[PDB]
Design a protein around this ligand. Sequence first.
Ligand code: HEC
Length: 81
Amino acid sequence: DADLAKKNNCIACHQVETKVVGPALKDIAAKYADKDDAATYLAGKIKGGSSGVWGQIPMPPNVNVSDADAKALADWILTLK
Ligand code: HEC
């Protein structure tokens, strides 16, 4: 899989097992979006950006993509296992 997050930017710094700027996807998803529907929870951090939640560089305010194309991603993020 992997295509929308790459077509936009999510993957630009979020791989599946490895990471470049921030944390990888297999983790960001298994880190907080691995319990309940955190997808709706952490949805506040994705756009809220991060500063000292991980340790990497501070990510800018990027939610997912645009209107719906953005949500279509949050789905593939909860199914990266
Ligand atoms: C490089 C320019 C990035 C792109 C493109 C995207 N993200 Fe990112 N993200 C990046 C970094 C360096 C970090 C770590 C910040 C830190 O605290 O050290 C992150 C982190 C996240 C997180 C974690 C939020 C948290 O739990 O505090 C999420 C949920 C996240 N990023 C989501 C996300 C999405 C959905 C992106 C595509 C729209 C995306 N990121 C792109 C760097 C980069």
